[PDB]
Amino acid sequence: PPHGELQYLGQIQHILRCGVRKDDRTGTGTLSVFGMQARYSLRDEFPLLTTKRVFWKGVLEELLWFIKGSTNAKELSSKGVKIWDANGSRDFLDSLGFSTREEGDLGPVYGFQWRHFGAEYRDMESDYSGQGVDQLQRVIDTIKTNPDDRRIIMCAWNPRDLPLMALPPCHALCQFYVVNSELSCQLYQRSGDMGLGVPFNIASYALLTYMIAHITGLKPGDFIHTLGDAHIYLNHIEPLKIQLQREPRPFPKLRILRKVEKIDDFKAEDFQIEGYNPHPTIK
Template identity: 75%
Template sequence: MRFNLRKTFPLLTTKKVFWRGVVEELLWFISGSTNAKVLQEKDIHIWDGNASRDFLDSIGLTSREEGDLGPVYGFQWRHFGARYTDMHTDYTGQGFDQLLDVIDKIKNNPNDRRIILSAWNPSDLKLMALPPCHMFAQFYVANEELSCQMYQRSADMGLGVPFNIASYALLTCMITHVCDLIPGDFIHVLGDFKT
């Protein structure tokens, strides 16, 4: 699916999309947090099921504190390769900050074809409450426009996909703003999906 971000924003209008949830979750990812309680305190409950004691126990994460999702999206974006301890640890300076690298490449080497943000880290999958569904984004700069292509390995068309489209379109617009560019296209590639 391709969405033009130049003068429009792809927020589904035939179904209510939890916009505040989209924004808060994206900011939570950007912060590098893995603590679902941060979202719960803002009345965002999209991660509650995967952060519950029962769920964590059911997938073998019995020593994990309730609310600790493990090295999920934000951790991978901001600390890729760091050794995960828990949601309370300060990981400043640990691992590779992919988001910072994306922004740096866009600003300083916009023709680079390796402007990539990945949440998929095979060595950490067993530590995650839920493996990443939207897992890989590549950014392109052409004619002062920033475009993003995101691959989603698993997609729930009715529930998650409208949310994910809005989230990555917003991320693209945010990076565009920081890098003083114009939004281009958001391209969404789906792997396994269900309706």
């Protein structure tokens, strides 16, 4: 059976051949294609890319960080994941006109949008309980009660709250699907970096599907990755050409060590990645 990561490497190939030059916000050149799709099976394996190492502690800890509804970068930083700190810095906030915000306040980012959507945002330490729509829980509720529902969605894109946040959501929305007791998830990503960010994103929503599947007593199905703007930076072309030559090694497996009945109740210790042996790194 064809390895799943080939789908990903195949998209790298398509961008090289058929991609065209396009500049990003900073004027940095990229080779870009508009619209793409990839399917990764979550059945008895976890699509964690083996041709280049993926940052798992970042994926796991960031997802738990989303579920807590935390907009505070410091709360994630204290766990060892620094990826959101740059956008929460005192200097960066001031440049955006946010000067009245304490350091670490990212605005109404993913965490806020997931649990509290529609609510009026003020600051990272405020209590939003009962305010706004809880999408994450409505998703879990709907999957339990009405699995045939076509309408299951979690949307982080809020035109109202856009100017209030550091950077707009890269994850626009995701849809869930249930058939024959299998839970599938499709993500719509407006933009992604195939060489840097995309592998990380695949891991996140694969993990999310695993988590929700556990709560709802379902088996992980396929994960569909939809990309609005698929691009590779021109500085990554050759090192990617080398990565393409590498043969993908078998995906690891993800284990939930205990039984969890609530999405909020998940802890980082409950997750174990076994059998993950990626290729060496590259410079």
